Amino acid sequence: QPMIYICGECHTENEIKSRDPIRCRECGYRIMYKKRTKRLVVFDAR
């Protein structure tokens, strides 16, 4: 299963396996966020 993430500033679609050093392809950044969930979320207008 491809567990995918986003990097710090070029927002490269970085699928990395576990235990991998945090690196940005096409870059060298080492800060990295998780993508948004795919599950539906209900919000109330109140």
Residues marked as binding for Zn(2+)? 7, 10, 24, 27
Contact yes or no for 15/7 (Cβ under 8 A): no
Task: Tell me the C-alpha distance between 14 and 24, whole Å.
Answer: 7
DSSP 5: E
Asked whether position 11 contacts other proteins by CB under 8 A, the answer is no
Asked whether position 45 contacts other proteins by CB under 8 A, the answer is no
DSSP 35: P
28 binds, among Zn ion, other proteins, none (CB under 5 to 8 A by kind): other proteins
Which residues define the annotated binding site? 7, 10, 24, 27
The residues binding other proteins (CB under 8 A) are 1, 3, 5, 18, 21-22, 28, 30-37, 39, 41
